Structure 1
Amino acid sequence: RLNTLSPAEGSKKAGKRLGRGIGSGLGKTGGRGHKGQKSRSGGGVRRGFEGGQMPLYRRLPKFGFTSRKAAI
């Protein structure tokens, strides 16, 4: 019977493979569009980057303090 067990429907998806033909859908850059920083290998912006504008976590003021008694 070892060649009769099957998984539940919807348990597997087979993943996404990029750049494998036209009919496969996401080929020819595999869904990352045309030129640009995001299209490059290893490209992208770090967390909180807004394109040069002051990030939200920098526009706002830090407040409060940590209490050691709260951890005990």
Structure 2
Amino acid sequence: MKLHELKPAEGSRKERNRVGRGVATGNGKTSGRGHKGQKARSGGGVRPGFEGGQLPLFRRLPKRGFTNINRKEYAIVNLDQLNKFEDGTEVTPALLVESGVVKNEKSGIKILGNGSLDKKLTVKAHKFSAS
């Protein structure tokens, strides 16, 4: 490129469709005929004139919790945890480990909360722990 040679990609640009022009543009009226192409141009969000969108309230939502990490890692060997956010999670409100196809490599562990299948594996590997 010396700024007199440029040729960008294929499918990075297009026409813009100016409307209010032409007759042979494929436009000229652009919506209906007297119908409701007026300026406001709304049926009003979502509404047909009646009330099929009204169903019961089946709810509550208080505070909540944990993240996830599967047991599927083969990154570390013996490098017990809460050190890390690199090859696991970035954020932690409350940490928790789970299943996800087995870890045959033997590491310890350092965790809040624990899954059951995870427990019975990591005990058959090096360690189980709960803090």
Q: What TM-score do you get using the length of structure 2 for normalisation?
A: 0.44
- Aligned positions of 1:24-63 closer than 5 A: 24-27=25-28, 29=29, 31-37=30-36, 39-50=37-48, 52-56=49-53, 58=54, 60-63=55-58
Aligned partners of 1:21 and 1:35: how far apart in 2? Answer: 19
What is the number of equivalent residue pairs in this alignment? 66
Partner of 2:13: 12
Q: What TM-score do you get using the length of structure 1 for normalisation?
A: 0.73
Distance change (3 Å), C-alpha of 1:49 and 1:14: same
Partner of 1:22: 23
Shift of 1:36: 2.2
Structure 1: 4+ residue segments shifted above 3 A: none
Instruction: Name whichever structure is richer in helix by fraction.
Output: 1
Identity among equivalent pairs (%): 29
Aligned partners of 2:7 and 2:20: how far apart in 1? Answer: 30
Computed over aligned residues only, the root mean square deviation of the Cα atoms, in angstroms, reads: 1.9
Aligned partners of 1:33 and 1:11: how far apart in 2? Answer: 32
Could you tell me which runs of 5 or more consecutive residues in structure 1 were left unpaired when the two chains were aligned. Answer: none
61-70 vs 5-14, which deviates more? 61-70
Could you tell me which runs of 5 or more consecutive residues in structure 2 were left unpaired when the two chains were aligned. Answer: 67-92, 94-131
Structure with larger Rg? 2
Aligned partners of 1:70 and 1:49: how far apart in 2? Answer: 37
